[PDB]
RNA sequence: ACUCUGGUUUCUCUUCAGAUCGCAUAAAUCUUUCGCCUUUUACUAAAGAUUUCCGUGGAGAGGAACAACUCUGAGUCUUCCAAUUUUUUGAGGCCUUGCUUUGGCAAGGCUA
């Protein structure tokens, strides 16, 4: 859209975007890119398609890293969550007396 | 104003305007030369070492500083 | 100063964006090393699928948890470069194509 | 510049003021300047003959002004 | 650039124990209540030793600052992060 | 850093207050700031908050608030004095309320932290609440302002709407609760504080005007404040400020001179830090390096709003002026505190906090160090100075003036201040002062009075932590190898140690149960437990609640009871209590204390109950704030009543005991009034002792409650769930399930989010914060609270009713179920027997 | 409002890598349990130990770029205060004693 992505209508296909606009990236080793907050809201806008409108990670509650966790030690596993193997077998200690 | 940064920390004798002596270390000034003296011993007229401690001194009363002694350790 | 510019609303919704698109600036990263979905399985299962779909799901989740709890730190390295001495022999030869 | 001495804490008390020349003087303070001028209600004199002034509402120049007494309690 | 560090001392001295001495010889030992810019203190539970030697008791104290000679304050404020 | 310890000589330049509010209101983050701006080599990370003051691996891990940490600093103030301040950061989870106590029984004031989003909540309310018991003096900060503008975008007159709606919220519940009207709160009195701990923001009217004062001159910034909040507006043709709005369309003037720049401070770097940033920060004075412009928003954010307000003088001269130093709010201190009261010489000691009077310490607070072996008290010195490596005699919570036995003579080696994670050591502490104390760790359990020895032989101890909450939630704790039960036996002194209102009780059947208020605190107690007290393996039985025994009908006929020697005979009759009585004795409202005239006027006249039967009134229940009461009724015209006074008191440790524990449920009879329809006193003293008696009073007590239909009591949580609007309905059913009764659902005002209040059974409130928060998928959150006992469904004397096993019992059956099971985790007999 | 401040890019090299080297993620070897089991070679899946590989940061060294002044900052950098509160004055003159270092000092009373 020429008025909506006009900041990054110039460059948003280009093979390395802005290579050699020495304002936003470092050099030709592409790397340390420094942008502006119109474009990026821009490339925000475009992408909104690919990136989970998540505010927070209270969604994350029992379904993060800590729980996968938590749930391969115990040997059980979160509905949604993964199934892993015992992390120690303990077969004749899983069901006590 | 740096004629009296050069001072700070120098044992300094402070003549007054009743013509007391104020024996201190010049730790700070001010626009007003307002003093702060620690440990500043008064001297009268014969003379002697009235202890006082942290003296500020209002700059209306001060007449003259001068160097006693080089900066403590 | 208005009390708000064009550039208000976006920079606040740029606020609460995920990760690559909260930054002003930031480093270059490969293509390689960009997972675009990283996020889609990360989520629970949408409703209303089949079976196939979420145990694709927590077989995703599974992978994941994997390498991230054996993930060790990168050993100590004295930075010695292919193809940084193969232009250094008199074998190999630079070009663009 | 000139911040007023702060005496809210000293209005409608009984207080004795020294004065400048050795002076002395008892009254009720109403008010001040940014100068601690102040002007006095139910002014008793107070001299150091001995026999006590009254006059009433005065008004006295901060530069004379040595200290303030609160008599009554703040 | 605008306020000068003895003010500061002054304006730490609040609270603590301090003895005023005045330009008519009256030296005021007490507990500084509050401090101004200018160095009017109002102090309280004042000891005071006039020029005869003799001592009063004077429960709150309101100094015009013009008239002081000097403070003695704590040498506690020899620490105080004004004089650093 | 000496003129730190010098500043505790001075009593009027420190001050100990608390920071108390909700959960995640930002006192941690505030705490951080000072530390920050105190502190020049302390600076958070960019993403990650500072975390500081947080020093347990729970804290961090689970992000929740777990132990109050102390923190001792320097802060200049507005003027420029450099003033002392303690904080206890608290944990503002309500399952943590006791922590919050320990350091609220040591604290002069009270700042309490308010989401300005969130709103008040419920451990809001509750800590007002029980701040206004101790009669503390109350400072309210809304922090997270910033979540008005970045998060809501409510336009500066919806802000300032919000922010008074908050403020007279506030106001009413304090004005609910304290009838002292000098609790009013008002940003313009110096009550009101506002603050995003976040960005580094904090200001209040006064701090703002000596903003804006500094900025031009000449400006006096306190009376500027005075007229800096409310329906006041701003003229500019006058330059004058009114009532009323020179114009139309004019903005009040807290928006107009506070609301309106911090809008356009903050939109101008989330916005347009390249493009409009420069002018406006130069405009400010603000001047920021080309590297420093290049951060991201939140760390370039609060480096501007760092620059700009500079020192957090608001938060200090907020507390200097409406906190009392410990040298003048001593007095309520010991007024309230004290067991003795002001009145004796050690209180008016104690009141004037005199360095150079008796040594008096009162510790309330335990804190584990790296091995765990070894406590460290902490304390507020009330009196005269602690030296290092000093003997000092230490009481206990039981020590009277009488028994001895309590106290403790012990070496104090060397002592700090703590100022969170480091502490500085020091050779003594003055009086008003926060101290850890080491080497008094063995004789000191929870509260404790520390004295010295050889001198004030008639000192009291101080009254016992008094908590808000009635732990209810009791799991069974035990030892997976046997031979190690020595060890997790030790660990269990740690934690009953570490935790103030940890209740570590041995039943008969040798069950080591363990009280703890909800599912987070016994959480964090047996991870304490496992990982760093014992070290070794544990295991836990499936979570219950307590529950209490009462009656709901009058006893049939008058049971008797006959000492061993059938000389003395008691014969009782059972009855339930009013109600709110029970409440009334369990809030203090009325006092074993008070003479007879006064609560015999109170029965007679609030409780319509007869004259002579309110003077008959003799104890009450299980302590001397039991819900139960025990009434004579012995008439004068066939009993004589100075002979029954002298086994009276024996009758009273009688009753108590059998109050304490129940016939049914083995403990805890609640809201059962007895009276004593018949009193047979042997003649000669030795027929009728307390051995004798008391036994004899247990057994009549059980008599009459048993033959009266009893009931079982469950706990009733009161659980309030902020939650999105399209969540409500899920939550409907998901209390529905666990058959809980809604009460309320209010939207919050100012806010997009409702609150639910429903009233949950406590046995039935296991994982039903994960449930819920898990249901809607982390958008209802929740909160429990112990709220009252209700009567369960079902009759415990049934016994035509089967239990089966591993099933869920239908209503009818739960209060059979309820006390047989129990009886099996004590074991008990298997049916209470009515003959004994 | 000034003199000196001296660039950044890029190609390499040499060491150190603490930190999510990496907001990403492999393989192999070895050792334990395993699942298959029938011989190697592939393997099943968890733990543990190394290793290689695709990468990374910093430091130092050596080039080119290529210009170049400057950026920037050390600072004096520069364009106004006599009316109570400090720095544009209540200042100066007389009397008694203790000692006079016979110059006079100290205290008090004064007078203006």
Redesign the interface.
Same mark, same amino acid.
């Given at each position: 859209d020429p008025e909506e992505d006009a900041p990054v209508l110039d460059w948003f296909y280009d093979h390395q975007p802005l290579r050699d606009s020495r304002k936003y990236v470092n050099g030709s080793t592409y790397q340390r890119w420094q942008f502006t907050l119109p474009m990026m809201s821009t490339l925000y806008r475009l992408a909104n398609q690919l990136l989970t409108d998540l505010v927070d990670d209270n969604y994350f509650y029992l379904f993060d890293l800590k729980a996968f966790f938590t749930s391969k030690a115990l040997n059980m596993a979160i509905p949604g969550g993964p199934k892993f193997e015992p992390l120690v077998r303990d077969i004749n200690l899983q069901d006590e007396d | 104003s740096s004629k009296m940064l050069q001072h700070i920390d120098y044992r300094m004798r402070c003549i007054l305007q009743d013509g007391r002596i104020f024996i201190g270390t010049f730790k700070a000034f001010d626009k007003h030369m307002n003093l702060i003296l620690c440990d500043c011993d008064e001297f009268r007229k014969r003379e002697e070492k009235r202890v006082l401690g942290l003296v500020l001194l209002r700059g209306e009363n001060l007449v003259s500083m001068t160097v006693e002694g080089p900066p403590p350790k | 100063t208005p009390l708000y510019t064009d550039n208000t609303a976006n920079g606040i919704a740029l606020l609460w964006a995920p990760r690559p698109f909260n930054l002003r600036s930031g480093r270059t990263r490969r293509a390689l090393d960009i997972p675009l979905v990283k996020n889609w399985y990360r989520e629970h299962c949408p409703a209303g699928q089949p079976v196939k779909v979420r145990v694709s799901y927590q077989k995703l989740l599974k992978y994941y948890v994997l390498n991230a709890l054996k993930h060790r730190p990168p050993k100590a390295q004295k930075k010695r470069y292919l193809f940084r001495s193969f232009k250094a022999t008199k074998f190999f030869q630079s070009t663009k194509l | 510049k000139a911040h007023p001495p702060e005496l809210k804490k000293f209005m409608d008390k009984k207080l004795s003021l020294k004065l400048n020349g050795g002076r002395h003087v008892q009254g009720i303070l109403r008010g001040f300047d940014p100068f601690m001028n102040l002007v006095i209600d139910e002014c008793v004199e107070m001299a150091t003959s001995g026999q006590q002034n009254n006059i009433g509402m005065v008004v006295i120049r901060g530069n004379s002004i040595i200290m303030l007494e609160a008599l009554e309690r703040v | 650039m605008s306020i000068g560090v003895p003010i500061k001392v002054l304006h730490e001295a609040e609270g603590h124990i301090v003895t005023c001495e005045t330009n008519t010889g009256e030296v005021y030992r007490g507990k500084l209540i509050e401090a101004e810019d200018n160095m009017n203190c109002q102090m309280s539970n004042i000891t005071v030793t006039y020029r005869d030697g003799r001592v009063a008791q004077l429960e709150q104290v309101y100094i015009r600052g013009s008239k002081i000679r000097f403070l003695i304050l704590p040498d506690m404020l020899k620490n105080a992060p004004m004089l650093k | 850093?000496?003129?730190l310890a010098?500043?505790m000589?001075?009593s009027?330049?420190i001050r100990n207050v608390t920071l108390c509010g909700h959960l995640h209101h930002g006192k941690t983050c505030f705490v951080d700031c000072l530390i920050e701006q105190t502190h020049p080599e302390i600076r958070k990370r960019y993403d990650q908050d500072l975390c500081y003051t947080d020093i347990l691996f729970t804290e961090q891990e689970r992000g929740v608030g777990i132990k109050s940490t102390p923190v001792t600093v320097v802060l200049?103030d507005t &003027?420029? &004095?450099?003033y002392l301040f303690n904080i206890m950061d608290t944990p503002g989870h309500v399952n943590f309320s006791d922590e919050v106590t320990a350091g609220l029984r040591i604290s002069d004031g009270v700042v309490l932290f308010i989401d300005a989003a969130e709103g008040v909540m419920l451990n809001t309310e509750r800590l007002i609440k029980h701040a206004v018991q101790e009669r503390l003096a109350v400072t309210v900060c809304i922090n997270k302002i910033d979540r008005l503008i970045?998060?809501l &975008?409510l336009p500066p007159t919806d802000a300032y709407y919000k922010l008074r709606h908050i403020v007279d919220e506030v106001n009413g519940l304090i004005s609910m609760y304290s009838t002292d009207e000098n609790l009013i709160l008002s940003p313009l009195l110096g009550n009101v504080c506002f603050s995003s701990s976040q960005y580094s923001i904090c200001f209040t009217l006064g701090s703002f005007a000596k903003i804006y004062a500094?900025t031009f001159?000449?400006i006096?910034y306190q009376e500027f404040a005075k007229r800096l909040w409310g329906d006041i507006y701003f003229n500019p043709k006058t330059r004058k400020f009114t009532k009323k709005a020179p114009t139309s369309s004019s903005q009040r003037s807290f928006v107009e001179f506070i609301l309106?720049p911090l809008? &356009?401070i903050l939109?101008?770097v989330?916005?347009?830090?390249?493009?409009?940033l420069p002018?406006?920060l130069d405009?400010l004075g603000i001047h920021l390096t080309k590297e420093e412009l290049?951060?991201?928003?939140?760390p370039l954010l609060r480096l501007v709003c760092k620059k700009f307000f500079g020192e957090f003088t608001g938060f200090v001269d907020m507390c200097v002026q409406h906190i009392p130093s410990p040298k003048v709010g001593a007095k309520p201190k010991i007024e309230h505190t004290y067991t003795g009261g002001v009145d004796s010489d050690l209180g008016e000691a104690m009141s004037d906090c005199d360095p150079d009077g008796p040594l008096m310490c009162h510790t309330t607070k335990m804190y584990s160090t790296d091995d765990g072996v070894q406590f460290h008290a902490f304390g507020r010195v009330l009196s005269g100075t602690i030296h290092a490596g000093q003997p000092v005699k230490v009481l206990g919570e039981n020590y009277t003036l009488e028994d001895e036995e309590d106290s403790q003579i012990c070496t104090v080696g060397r002592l700090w201040i703590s100022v969170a994670r480091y502490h500085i050591e020091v050779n003594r502490v003055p009086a008003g002062n926060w101290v850890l104390i080491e080497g008094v760790d063995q004789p000191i359990v929870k509260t404790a009075t520390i004295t010295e020895p050889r001198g004030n032989e008639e000192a009291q101890i101080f009254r016992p932590l008094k908590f808000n909450t009635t732990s209810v939630i009791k799991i069974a704790v035990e030892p997976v190898n046997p031979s190690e039960l020595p060890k997790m036996l030790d660990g269990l002194r740690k934690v009953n140690k570490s935790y103030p209102s940890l209740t570590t009780k041995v039943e008969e059947s040798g069950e080591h149960v363990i009280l703890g208020t909800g599912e987070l605190y016994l959480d964090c107690v047996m991870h304490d437990l496992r990982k760093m007290y014992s070290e070794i393996d544990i295991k836990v039985a499936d979570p219950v609640v307590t529950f209490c025994e009462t009656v709901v009908e009058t006893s049939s006929l008058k049971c008797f009871a006959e000492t061993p020697n059938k000389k003395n005979k008691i014969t009782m009759i059972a009855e339930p209590l009013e109600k709110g009585l029970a409440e009334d004795i369990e809030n203090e409202v009325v006092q074993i204390t008070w003479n007879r005239k006064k609560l015999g006027e109170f029965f007679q006249t609030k409780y319509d109950w007869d004259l002579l039967a309110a003077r008959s009134i003799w104890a009450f229940g299980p302590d001397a704030t039991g819900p139960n009461i025990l009434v004579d009724d012995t008439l004068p015209s066939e009993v004589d009543k100075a002979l029954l006074g002298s086994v009276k008191d024996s009758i009273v440790q009688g009753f108590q005991w059998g109050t304490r524990e129940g016939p049914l449920c083995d403990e805890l009879i609640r809201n059962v009034k007895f009276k004593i329809l018949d009193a047979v006193v042997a003649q000669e003293p030795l027929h009728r002792g307390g051995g004798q008696i008391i036994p004899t009073a247990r057994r009549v007590v059980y008599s009459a409650f048993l033959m009266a239909t009893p009931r079982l009591m469950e706990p009733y949580y009161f659980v309030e769930v902020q939650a999105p609007a399209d969540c409500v309905s899920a939550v409907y059913t998901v209390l529905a399930r666990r058959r809980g009764h809604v009460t309320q659902d209010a939207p919050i005002p100012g806010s997009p989010l409702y609150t639910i209040k429903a009233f949950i059974p406590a046995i039935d409130s296991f994982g039903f914060e994960?449930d819920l928060?898990?249901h809607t998928?982390?958008?209802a959150?929740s909160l429990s609270v112990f709220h009252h006992w209700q009567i369960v469904p079902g009759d415990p004397l049934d016994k035509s009713i089967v239990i089966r096993p591993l099933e869920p019992q239908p209503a009818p059956h739960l209060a059979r179920e309820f006390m047989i099971k129990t009886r099996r985790r004590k074991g008990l007999s298997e049916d209470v027997s009515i003959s004994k």
């Open positions: - | - | - | - | - | 850093m000496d003129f010098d500043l000589d001075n009027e330049l200049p &003027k420029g &004095k450099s970045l998060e &975008k500094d001159g000449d006096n309106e809008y &356009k939109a101008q989330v916005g347009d830090v390249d493009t409009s002018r406006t405009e290049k951060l991201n928003i939140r994960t928060r898990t998928q982390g958008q959150f």
